[PDB]
Amino acid sequence: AFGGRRAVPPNNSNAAEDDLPTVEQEFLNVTSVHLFKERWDTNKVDHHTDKYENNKLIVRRGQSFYVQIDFSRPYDPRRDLFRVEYVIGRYPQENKGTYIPVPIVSELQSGKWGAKIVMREDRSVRLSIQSSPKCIVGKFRMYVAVWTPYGVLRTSRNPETDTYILFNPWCEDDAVYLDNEKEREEYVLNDIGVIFYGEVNDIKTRSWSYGQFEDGILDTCLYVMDRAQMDLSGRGNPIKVSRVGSAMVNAKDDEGVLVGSFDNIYAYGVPPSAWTGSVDILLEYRSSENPVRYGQCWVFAGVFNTFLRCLGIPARIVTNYFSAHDNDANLQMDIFLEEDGNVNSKLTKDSVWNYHCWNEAWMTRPDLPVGFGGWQAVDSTPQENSDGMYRCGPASVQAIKHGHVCFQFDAPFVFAEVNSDLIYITAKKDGTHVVENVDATHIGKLIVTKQIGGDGMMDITDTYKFQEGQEEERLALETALMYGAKKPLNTSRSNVDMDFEVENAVLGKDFKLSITFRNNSHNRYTITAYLSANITFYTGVPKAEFKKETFDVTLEPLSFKKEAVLIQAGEYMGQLLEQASLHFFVTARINETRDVLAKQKSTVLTIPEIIIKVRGTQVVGSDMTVTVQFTNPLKETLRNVWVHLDGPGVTRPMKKMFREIRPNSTVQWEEVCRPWVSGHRKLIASMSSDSLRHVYGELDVQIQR
Template sequence: MAETPGTGAAFGGRRALPPNTSNAEENDPPTVELQGGLMPRGFNPQDYLNVTDVHLFKERWDSNKVDHHTDKYDSKKLIVRRGQPFYIQIDFSRPYDPRRDLFRVEYVIGRYPQENKGTYIPVPIVSELQRGKWGAKVITTEDRSVRLSVQPSPDCIVGKFRMYVAVWTPYGVIRTSRNPETDTYILFNPWCEEDAVYLDNDKEREEYVLNDIGVIFYGEFNDIKSRSWSYGQFEEGILDACLYMMDRAKMDLSGRGNPIKVSRVGSAMVNAKDDEGVLVGSWDNVYSYGVPPSAWTGSVDILLEYKSSQTPVRYGQCWVFAGVFNTFLRCLGIPARVVTNYFSAHDNNANLQLDIFLEEDGNVNSKLTKDSVWNYHCWNEAWMTRPDLPVGFGGWQVVDSTPQENSDGMYRCGPASVQAIKHGHVCFQFDAPFVFAEVNSDVIYITAKKDGTHVVKTLDTTHIGKLIVTKQVGADGMKDITDTYKFQEGQEEERLALETALMYGAKKPLSTEGIPKSRSDIHMDFEVERAVLGRDFTVVLTFRNNSPTRYSVTAYLSGNITFYTGVSKGEFKNETFNVTLEPLSFKTEAVWVRAGEYMGQLLEQAFLHFFVTARVNETNDVLAKQKSVVLTIPKISVKGDPAQRHRAVGRGVSALGLRASEADGQHDQ
């Protein structure tokens, strides 16, 4: 059958049209579109081929949903993936004759559809479908019915399309009326090689697209915990909620086929910092008129509440933002996973190092110290090609919806290529310097002297990004992916990556060339015995003298209640002591911490952070160490009717900021 003629650049003519930024808004095309715009005398549309019904085969068991891996969506609409054929049937008023009858299928999205924007798609009837292009092929004809195989292009817009059938007459076009029953959702397709989100591993597709239950890791590097999270991307109403997020962002429909743009908009819209997005963040332990972050156990309640109320939901912290963002990405068809970085740097001045300022007595100068270390931090990775970057930087991309720093005028982060981060190529968009600093910063300890001068005292190159993990494919265990972000600490490649990052435009850091070499060969470390909530415990410091010289050391210990973001709420313990070290010897000092010193200051998602600095008096060498402590909560037994203990997916129960079912506490940094 010959291809049908076009109908112009847009419905309503070629006049300039407003931006098309809403999937929900509609502007229906005319049901009769006559040549010259005038109805000829004696013209009766019923005299020509008319559409009487359209069948989309949209039940869960139909091949359309099964073949497109959309049978899990709780929706009565047809949901398909781009770049892959699906089947429809059109019933006409009389038998279809391909020699004299002309018709085509049209897909429309938004209020101001334009063919050159991809928002009005006239699908030609062709003899053979061509890879990479829209097309419709007649499969069978029977009596008055025609069955078509319709193939979307692999780069078409992702969203909800309205469908029409247009029939040609000698006088113009007759088009079907608006029918919500024929609405069709088109999603990204990780099973299609031509799609930008194509993932060639079936087990990974099962995990990163189709798995609606996940595990998010949290806690502390030496005491890692996990929590289950219900992504619920297939639940009723979630797909519409995800499309609403892009509408709320006023994202142009023409850009919604690009996973780079979609994930970047999503990273901004999951937080409500500057755009009335989904979640309000709160890290101050005040959760009035909202739900504490630790009470959420899934994304469904959050997204449905946001869609229905059209106002931000209260409250979230990093793992909640990451869980909701994962739902958004997987629901639209972008492979995604939640990643946890232990000892995650927050570099405020983009110099790729954390500057910790100390008073001359060893205490931290909180006024000068603007950078912070998060005990752990969760973000997302999304899988996609990066045609905007050199070859080799596609694959996993960091996207982070926790509002930390402003990026191009909004609180968002990414997508940043994981491969580019590993090699220090932070010149490539988006936000690679910030992510690089999160996983590979050096910690610089600087003494702020009373005369106003700053003296760099010591450097720690191994504290940041100690472990980066995600959930295993097909299992609930932890997968170490640290080596995808950074080379092994101490290797030449790791230093080279940092030098490359500095070369590519990061702000110049404070010089570390003047750091004096240790002249005393004194080493210091400390351990915190397993601390149980409500009980006393000790901090044991060990000083080791590896030299043949006798030295004296003055040490300062500070204990703080600190949010998982590294921000101190207040000091609960400080102690100064002197240690004499004989040649080739070691000595331990135990600091007793009483429960009464910290119990009254505990907050949700806060932990105990100890900072120790020591000065070798004979040489002025400065030693510094810091560690975080996760309090262990005794096991809690709950008895009673299981039905009374049930909670709907999305919210849980918290106690003292730590979930009662998680006996060992929780933290996020």
């Protein structure tokens, strides 16, 4: 058999290695190599890699680090020639960036690999080695090679000098350069996140362990790339790293990290709501070598955020409220109505997500016109795009905002996710359709991300979207429609306002809903209004109409009328899906004019929290007792209750099951923890049973030493 497709196989694994020749004795031989790689030393402290739980050297590219080489006799520039080498993959080649000869230079030059001798003492040489800020990101093998008249002598393989080179947000020349220390700490070095969920008028918050500095996670991130068969030459490009790595998050057929499941039962797996962070998922991915079950969007985003921050690409998780996923770049979503004004539930099949999470990753975009760098949206939860059912992005958030959705990747899809209109259409009994009105403000209503400060939410709606109704927004849509956005149904689009408001309620309580009508006309109207209320998944998918009601309203001239109804706990209580989401349509026909009024609202019931307590001394290297408390407030008994505890630098992720919990009963779980990370830290918990799940709790702790 001949290798006729190419002379050397793709170099697409960091784990694979070649064996370099040592010979390829008055000449220099190296007796020792010192990397000054302790976590308190200069290199890791200054490279901002001292948090990794890893005893190998770890630097960031584009920036100098110090090494010392000890020789058999003193190096003498009049007769000796040596260089350090960095090698990666089974098939390294200099012109692919995977064999890197580092030349001894008099002065370091910006942008280039080089090694300057900064000290010469007895048989030792100290070097300041600068890597290219374009360098491939991975774990390299280091060698020293000595050039003689007879050939090259080289050190033997030594795993103790293996060096990780990562992306460098502090380096001005790096594509990932971020010029604000507060931002770098949050978006690169903070290992604890906050995810926003619930619904726009009742924003819920939960904590998430990114856990990027934990033991084994860096190596797992490299493994992800190897399992993608990612060419080593693309691993210094933060765009392709985002592109490929996000494609690995969703598992298709035994090939990526997380199996997606939205089925509310999760039979041979763990429920998406049980995860407390990315650590146990990634390490189970790596140890099993097979997808982990199961995830949904915030779990994909959690894990992907860990991947990016671990490699050094600044990253954050975004929550969009009222999200059109499945858009296919079309900007109109339809609600169909019967001739009397009711919602047609046979035909209304497209749903709005109450919220949806994706990721943003900071980088220049030298593939695009100037102005498109900064945050790039990446959504690893698949939707139909130009190529098939896949992740979307990296798409420039600036390009999305301006409508310039020809620039890669998948910009039209993220654009439609936050900018679609709802179209209310009557489906008539003769089979024709009539367009009743349009809602342009519902989708992409609020977009938020964790603040830099602490756990508050930051409103980043206007980074994706210009002001509704105004000229920049109009210009962006006009340009978007040239480049793959679609909005086919032209909306050449009486004098009655209708709204409604739904109270937020604790799980198991009743709640009120009231509908408001304003007649600004001088004539009287008879209206028939319909209330339709469904149990839904957080994606908007409706499971059942749990309440339905019709209201006969007469409206006087120049009048305001409010109507109220009580929803009782027993109308929804055995029927909720996980996350306890509810959806409300209020639709109505004005008899005199045949106009339609229409409004939608989402609610989630408030799920009770876990209580976490601590007794003892809170010190790196010392024992503390953590108590995890859960009180079952339901009038039924919860079964197979798995409790999860987490908190990076404080404990590995752990879980504990309780066979049942009788009504109104409490359980307590005690674990002795021994912290390895000092300072402001956090303990984090979740609970999943065979019914009630999406239960969380956290506790901020401060650690000493």
